[PDB]
Amino acid sequence: TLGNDLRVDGATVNITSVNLYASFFPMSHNTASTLEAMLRNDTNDQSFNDY
Amino acid sequence: RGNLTYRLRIPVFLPLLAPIIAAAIGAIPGIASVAIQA
Amino acid sequence: LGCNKMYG
């Protein structure tokens, strides 16, 4: 809440462990393979724009 | 097993005669758990 | 189906 300089006030961050947690939809292997094959085509390109 | 055994001599991918015979036997009300062996 | 979300 104050614009105090935490660096001189004394404050440290000691990161112990960093992990990556991914969630996979357990879709059937057949439909997942079909979706992958269809999305590997050039016309099925995913487009994203920064808000 | 049973005293009587029936024999069919059909003149003759995926086999179909054995499933057909199994389904026909299972259609009998008094017979259950048809076993297929080759 | 697509999305058209953008500032402005």
Binding site: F25, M27, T34, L35, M38, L39, N41, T43, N44, Q46, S47, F48, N49 | - | L1, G2, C3, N4
Partner: protein, 48 residues
Amino acid sequence: PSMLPQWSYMHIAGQDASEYLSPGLVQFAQATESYFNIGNKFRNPTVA
């Protein structure tokens, strides 16, 4: 830029996602929209 204009390669002034996606992919997305929602992964132009 060699094969397509940039406003078409980046879907800024091209066709809808219902028109430039594969018909099979469009059908798949509309069939699985209730629980997987592929729809927000594609962009459409919306020009003025």
